[model samples]
Target: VNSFSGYLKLTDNVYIKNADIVEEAKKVKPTVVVNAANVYLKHGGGVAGALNKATNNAMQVESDDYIATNGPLKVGGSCVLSGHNLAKHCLHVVGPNVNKGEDIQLLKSAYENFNQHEVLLAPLLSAGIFGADPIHSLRVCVDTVRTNVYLAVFDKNLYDKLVSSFL
Candidate 1:
C-alpha cells in the first residue's frame, strides 16, 4: 500500500520524514515547534505562515513585541516565545542567505541552538526561497540536533530524495 504517513529514525532520538509539522505541534505535549524565519522574524510563508495561522496570528504579535525591544534576530541566533498552540514554546531561528560565503556554518548554528525539549518539530531551515538544498539542510539537522526532533518534509520529491540519501 502507498502511504505518506510513516517516519524513519535517523538516530535514537530523531525522526526525519514527511509529516504535518503544524498539526503535530498542536497537541498538548511537551514538544516545541521551530520556525524558519528571516532576521525580522516575520511568519510570512512556509512553516512560519502555517504556524502563525494555527496559533491565530498571535505569533506575529509576539515576534513584533520581541523585536520592538530586542532588535532584529541575528542570523545563527534564536529566541523562544510562548506557544499559542498546545506546544510548550515556539522556537524561532534565522538562517543565513545561501549566497553568503559562511551560509553553511550559519545554518548549522541555527540548528544547534534548539532548546532542550522533550520533542521538537522542525522544518528544513533555509530550504525554501532562502535557497538551501533540502538534503544538505537535513544532514546539518541530523548532525546538530541534541534532543529529539522530527524533521518535517512537505515536499514529495524531497521526501523521495531523502529516502535515497538518508539510507
Candidate 2:
C-alpha cells in the first residue's frame, strides 16, 4: 500500500477513513474503504504484519491489488497525511493533500459532487486512535462541513458538545 492511496483516491471511486482499519469499513458502506488492517500505528512497524488475508466479503475488501489484482488498498496510512487545504479553518488539519495527482483530483471531485448535506456521524479521532477526544473530532468535522447539521451522539456530554460546537 505504498502508493496505493493515490491509486484508489484517484483511479478507484471511494472515500478513505483514517479511523478503525477493518472494523469501521465493515460497519459503514463507503464507496471504498481505507484501513490499516494488520498494521498497528505505534512504532511504524508498517502494515506488512497486520495484513488481512481473511475471506470476509462483507467489507469492500481488496488486496494491494490495484493494477492486475494482488494487494489491499493500504489506505488511511499516508492518505491521512495527504490532506491539504481542504480544511479552511484548519492549518494542519486539512486533508487529501497530494499535489496535482489523482488523489487530489478525486478529492476535488468529491467536493464538487457532494451536496451540502448535514452529516450526523461519529467522531473520527474519538474512537481512541488519533488521541483526540470525541468533542474535538465532532467539532472539526461539523465546522469544516459548515452547512447546517443535526448530528446525534450516544454520550450526553458529546451530544451537548455537538450542539454547542455547531450551533
Candidate 3:
C-alpha cells in the first residue's frame, strides 16, 4: 500500500515520512514543528512561508513579538510559538543561508536550542531555499536529533529520490 501510515528509519530516533509536511505534522501531533526562518523572522519564502499560511499568519505575529524584544534572530538560534495551525507548537529557527557550507553546524545548533521532548517533526533544514543538498541535510539531522524525529517528505516520488541518494 502507498498509505502514509508509517515511517522509514534513517537512524536511531530518526525517521522519514513520505507524505505532505502539514498532514504528517498533524498526524504526529508533535510538541513542535521546526520553522525555518530568516534572521529577521520574515517567513516570506520556502517552508517558513508555507507555515505562515498554514498557521493563518500567526507565526508572523509571534515572530513580531520575538523581534521586538529579542532582536534579529541569529543563525542556529530559535524561538517557540503556538503551532496555530500545524501542530501544538512551532520552533522558529534561523537556518543557514543559500550555499552556506555551515549548514551542518547551524542545523545542529538550531536543533539543540529547542526544548527537548518525546516526539518532534521537522523539514529538511537547509535543503529548500537555504540551498543545501537534501542528502547532506538529512545526514546532519539524523546525527543531531536525540529524540524520535519524524522528518517530513513531500511525496512518494521525493521519498524515492531521497532514498536513492542518501539512504
Candidate 4:
C-alpha cells in the first residue's frame, strides 16, 4: 500500500520516500501536484509525460494554452495549470538546467514557487533531464518548502542515495 516512509518538519511536514506521485495525487484532497517542466512547458517525458498521460492529456492542452498566452517559462519561474482527473491544480516549475550551469538557486526558486498547500505532491525537481544532483535536490526541497509536501522519488537507486543521506 502507498504510505509515507518518514517525515521532517520545517514549517510543515515533509514526507519523503520512493513513491508513485500520480497515485498520491489521486488519493489526496484539495491538493496541488507539481510538474518539473521544460522551458516550453511541454510534457515531453519523465514525470511530466507520465502525469500528462495519466491525466489523459489534459495537462498538455493546459500547458499549450498557457504557453500560447504567456510564452516560454524561464528557469526559476513557474506557471499554474488546471489539473485533470485526479488533481485540482498543477504547478509547473522550470528549474535550473545543471548542464547549462544554471544551478542551485533556480532549483531553490522552483521550490519556493510551489503553491504551499497542505498536501502538495512533488517529484524530485531538476534531477531528471535537467541533470541536477538528486541528493542536492532533496536537500534544497526539504529546506525551502513552505508547506506540507509528499516528496516522491521515482528512481530506486536515487531513492537509496537519498535514504542514506536522510539517515
In TM-score terms, which candidate is top? 1
Two-way TM-score contest, 2 vs 3, winner: 3
Residues 30-149 of candidate 2: C-alpha lDDT, one tens digit per residue: 232222221122212122112132223211222222213432222222222110111111001112323212232222222221123322112232222323344444434433444322
Tens digit of per-residue lDDT, candidate 4, span 1-167: 23344533323456776767777677663357888888898887888888898988988887888889988988888877787876788888888878778867778888888645555778888887788888788788877876778777777787777877663
Residue 70 CA error for candidate 3 (Å)? 1.2
TM-score, each model? 0.86, 0.29, 0.85, 0.86
* Root-mean-square deviation of every model: 3.9, 14.0, 3.4, 3.1
lDDT of 1 by residue, 9-80 (tens): 788766776666776666434347788877888888878888898878899998999999999988988898
* lDDT, each prediction: 0.76, 0.26, 0.75, 0.77
Worst 10 residues of 3 by lDDT: 1-10
Q: Which ranges in model 4 have alpha carbons more than 4 Å from their true place? A: 1-12
Off by over 4 Å in 1: 1-5, 27-30, 99-102
Ranking by lDDT: 4, 1, 3, 2
Among all windows of 10 consecutive residues in model 2, the one with the lowest summed lDDT is 83-92
Clashes of each: 0, 11, 0, 0
